[PDB]
Amino acid sequence: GISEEEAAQYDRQIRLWGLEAQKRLRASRVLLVGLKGLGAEIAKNLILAGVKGLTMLDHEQVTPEDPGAQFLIRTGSVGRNRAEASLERAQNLNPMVDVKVDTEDIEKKPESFFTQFDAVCLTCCSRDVIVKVDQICHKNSIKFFTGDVFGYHGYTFANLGEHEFVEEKTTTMVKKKVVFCPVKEALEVDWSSEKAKAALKRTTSDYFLLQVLLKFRTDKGRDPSSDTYEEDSELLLQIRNDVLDSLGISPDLLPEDFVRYCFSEMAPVCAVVGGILAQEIVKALSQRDPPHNNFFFFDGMKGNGIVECLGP
Amino acid sequence: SRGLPRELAEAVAGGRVLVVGAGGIGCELLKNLVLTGFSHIDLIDLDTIDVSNLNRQFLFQKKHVGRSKAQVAKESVLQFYPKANIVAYHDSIMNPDYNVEFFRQFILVMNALDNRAARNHVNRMCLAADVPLIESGTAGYLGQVTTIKKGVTECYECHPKPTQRTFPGCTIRNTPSEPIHCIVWAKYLFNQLFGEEDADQEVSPDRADPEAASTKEWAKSTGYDPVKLFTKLFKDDIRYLLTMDKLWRKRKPPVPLDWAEVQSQKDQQVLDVKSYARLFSKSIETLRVHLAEKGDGAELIWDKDDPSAMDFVTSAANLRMHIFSMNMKSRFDIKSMAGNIIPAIATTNAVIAGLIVLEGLKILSGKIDQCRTIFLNKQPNPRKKLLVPCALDPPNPNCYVCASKPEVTVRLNVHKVTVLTLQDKIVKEKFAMVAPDVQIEDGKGTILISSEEGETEANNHKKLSEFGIRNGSRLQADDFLQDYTLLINILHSEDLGKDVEFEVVG
Numbered sequence: 001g002i003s004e005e006e007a008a009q010y011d012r013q014i015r016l017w018g019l020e021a022q023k024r025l026r027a028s029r030v031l032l033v034g035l036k037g038l039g040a041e042i043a044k045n046l047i048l049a050g051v052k053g054l055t056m057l058d059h060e061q062v063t064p065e066d067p068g069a070q071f072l073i074r075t076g077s078v079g080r081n082r083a084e085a086s087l088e089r090a091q092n093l094n095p096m097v098d099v100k101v102d103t104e105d106i107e108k109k110p111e112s113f114f115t116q117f118d119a120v121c122l123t124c125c126s127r128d129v130i131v132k133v134d135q136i137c138h139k140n141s142i143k144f145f146t147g148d149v150f151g152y153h154g155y156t157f158a159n160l161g162e163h164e165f166v167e168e169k170t171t172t173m174v175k176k177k178v179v180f181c182p183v184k185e186a187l188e189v190d191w192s193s194e195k196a197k198a199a200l201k202r203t204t205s206d207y208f209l210l211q212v213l214l215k216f217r218t219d220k221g222r223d224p225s226s227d228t229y230e231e232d233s234e235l236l237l238q239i240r241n242d243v244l245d246s247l248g249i250s251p252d253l254l255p256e257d258f259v260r261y262c263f264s265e266m267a268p269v270c271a272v273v274g275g276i277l278a279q280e281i282v283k284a285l286s287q288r289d290p291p292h293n294n295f296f297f298f299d300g301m302k303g304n305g306i307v308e309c310l311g312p
Numbered sequence: 313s314r315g316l317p318r319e320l321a322e323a324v325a326g327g328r329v330l331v332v333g334a335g336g337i338g339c340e341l342l343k344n345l346v347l348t349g350f351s352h353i354d355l356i357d358l359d360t361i362d363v364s365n366l367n368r369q370f371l372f373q374k375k376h377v378g379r380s381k382a383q384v385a386k387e388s389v390l391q392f393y394p395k396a397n398i399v400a401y402h403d404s405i406m407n408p409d410y411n412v413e414f415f416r417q418f419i420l421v422m423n424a425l426d427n428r429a430a431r432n433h434v435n436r437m438c439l440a441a442d443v444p445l446i447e448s449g450t451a452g453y454l455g456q457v458t459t460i461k462k463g464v465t466e467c468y469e470c471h472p473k474p475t476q477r478t479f480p481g482c483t484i485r486n487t488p489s490e491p492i493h494c495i496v497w498a499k500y501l502f503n504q505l506f507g508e509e510d511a512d513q514e515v516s517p518d519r520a521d522p523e524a525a526s527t528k529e530w531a532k533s534t535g536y537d538p539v540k541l542f543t544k545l546f547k548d549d550i551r552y553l554l555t556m557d558k559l560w561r562k563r564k565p566p567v568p569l570d571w572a573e574v575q576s577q578k579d580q581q582v583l584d585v586k587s588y589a590r591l592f593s594k595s596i597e598t599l600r601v602h603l604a605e606k607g608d609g610a611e612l613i614w615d616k617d618d619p620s621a622m623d624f625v626t627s628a629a630n631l632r633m634h635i636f637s638m639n640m641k642s643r644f645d646i647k648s649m650a651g652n653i654i655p656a657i658a659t660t661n662a663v664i665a666g667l668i669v670l671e672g673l674k675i676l677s678g679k680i681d682q683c684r685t686i687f688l689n690k691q692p693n694p695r696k697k698l699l700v701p702c703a704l705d706p707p708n709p710n711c712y713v714c715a716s717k718p719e720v721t722v723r724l725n726v727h728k729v730t731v732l733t734l735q736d737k738i739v740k741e742k743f744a745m746v747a748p749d750v751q752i753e754d755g756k757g758t759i760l761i762s763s764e765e766g767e768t769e770a771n772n773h774k775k776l777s778e779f780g781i782r783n784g785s786r787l788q789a790d791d792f793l794q795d796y797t798l799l800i801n802i803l804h805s806e807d808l809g810k811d812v813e814f815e816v817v818g
């Protein structure tokens with residue numbers, strides 16, 4: 001039972017994923033941390049999608065290193081909270097979506113805070129934070145998403161547990177089963193087998209690029225920056241050696257020139273990954289189309305959008 | 313923005329770029345352009361903001377409903393980045409003021425339109441100016457991005473894009489078998505009463521049907537009275553269909569209606585026959601007010617979003633649908649078929665717009681070799697690629713636009729087709745020329761059609777055979793606005809059908 005103001009607004013998308021899946025989306029609230037380059041993209045097309053509420057969380061303050069990298073921040077908001085400075089712009093995208101803002105960092109949140117969210121999306125978080133939140137979400141049947149952007153590259157991960165959706169072909173209406181796995185099992189894969197070695201050749205190198213960058217964000221509290229390229233590459237050029245061998249893989253499986261195409265937040269790479277990641281959130285809350293299982297790696301140079309399944 | 317290779321970042325901050333259309337992809341494209349570093353941007357769009365658009369075009373709000381999509385977009389972008397030199401044109405890209413000299417100002421042109429006629433024009437303008445064109449299109453979960461540059465890649469018209477269905481008049485009003493035939497008849501009906509009087513859009517039963525043996529002047533003399541026009545259109549015109557008994561031997565043609573007979577006995581719900589006859593009366597009275605403000609015989613352009621215009625087509629198509637024993641459909645079901653509504657979401661536009669700028673950055677880097685055609689699928693293909701890239705194809709040597717000396721062959725009846733038919737339906741419509749200049753290849757240069765106003769209006773009514781045009785006559789069509797020259801070979805044929813005026817060999 002939607003009003004007439006919502007029927008004309010969402011008219012073009014009700015003709016795409018139906019009315020019932022829109023009503024399932026109207027009653028959903030999403031938790032999004034990492035309001036930044038990728039987070040602003042996800043928040044935009046989620047408030048336009050027609051959720052009930054969206055809680056934007058970010059402890060870091062507006063650093064003067066993203067002047068136009070985020071469009072939810074008006075000029076001269078340095079020193080203010082990144083989520084607060086993004087409130088007024090994100091609220092105007094849809095007055096029917098109460099956009100809430102949180103200031104405390106995601107690490108110091110109790111388990112009971114996430115229960116009010118039907119879905120959680122992480123951005124710009126260390127590995128330990130991603131595993132911590134996915135384990136909490138999987139405990140309470142909460143849909144978990146995460147993603148980041150590095151230069152021309154990007155990734156999205158999804159964990160929905162036992163997720164049943166409804167597809168159709170002929171008109172019709174078909175239910176299917178798709179089981180996801182926690183992110184901790186997807187990041188640490190046993191690459192020693194007849195199946196593991198044979199399936200490694202078909203796996204994109206952006207996954208190991210994701211391992212090298214997550215390890216970098218773990219060793220140091222920030223991703224590589226363009227100003228520190230002079231020897232942030234040499235640390236990256238050694239993490240690729242000290243990580244790929246820890247998994248028993250050849251070192252030059254990931255190309256060496258990767259330290260030139262994964263070094264900043266590029267707005268086109270945010271829109272591509274943010275559009276794909278937010279679409280996986282919409283089809284999950286509506287339980288309609290089959291979601292991507294379980295990774296999606298983007299390469300803005302070659303134009304590749306590869307969907308990997310590296311859980312088991 | 314600042315973090316880019318220094319030669320690339322210099323080309324972005326100084327180069328001038330053009331966006332054609334502020335629709336779905338248009339809003340997401342302006343954002344990705346500005347946040348990348350593009351400060352010299354030109355945006356042109358003619359449409360205005362509708363309440364149905366603000367679910368995927370985030371630069372607009374409910375406050376801006378009614379204003380132009382180009383003016384509001386320039387205002388919305390100057391808020392998060394005021395230091396952006398953006399020029400907004402509330403005009404059509406088909407306007408001859410935007411000549412090859414205008415297109416050559418930009419180092420990059422990106423399409424954001426939905427209709428082929430305007431895309432064919434922008435394709436021919438970017439070839440003449442030799443400026444790369446980034447063609448893009450979205451449809452639901454799907455989207456495509458490709459790069460067009462003269463002499464390197466194939467243009468927009470090197471391959472025929474899928475054309476929509478066209479049903480003949482003998483099938484529309486004499487044997488309508490599908491519910492779509494009633495919608496076209498309702499769109500025809502709205503045109504005859506409150507729109508421009510079209511010839512091929514006759515709603516009355518056709519007497520010259522091969523399977524066989526003014527409406528507006530009456531509409532304006534009736535006074536646009538709802539009770540009277542109902543009986544004439546839904547019973548008398550059906551009874552004159554019963555005059556012709558030859559069609560009804562194969563299928564059932566009941567039944568004529570009557571205003572005093574049926575009226576007395578969430579848009580997704582299919583209503584009865586008594587309700588659609590009331591909305592038909594309500595639509596005429598509401599459209600009579602929309603027509604009373606206009607003067608000097610001004611017409612009403614039908615809009616799918618216009619309620620009174622939608623209420624008329626829905627009610628008229630459903631009543632005729634019930635007339636021809638067809639099961640009536642809903643209003644929400646017919647609005648997708650009446651106005652060709654393409655379902656679009658914000659995510660698909662955002663992903664495509666991000667791929668446009670990524671392809672644009674490779675163009676401005678001289679890496680045109682690395683440019684790709686990217687397909688956005690709904691599910692991963694066997695290569696696990698949701699975004700499937702592929703190399704650009706070389707120009708088609710048999711294209712009628714970007715080839716060396718393009719040359720088409722038209723099969724038509726010379727003693728029937730007028731010169732006005734040659735200008736509008738053949739050269740300007742099928743071949744998508746804006747301001748055409750057509751002459752006869754015969755040494756003297758017999759001028760058929762001139763670009764300037766009315767220089768050849770004394771020829772429009774004349775038949776082609778009145779100019780010595782015969783089987784094999786060569787016409788040289790010129791559109792200097794597009795810097796395009798096409799040679800049209802004429803083939804004389806009299807076995808085409810009374811509903812077919814011409815056809816191209818291919």
Ligand SMILES: [Zn+2]
Binds near residue numbers: 467468470471708715
């Ligand atoms: Zn061509």
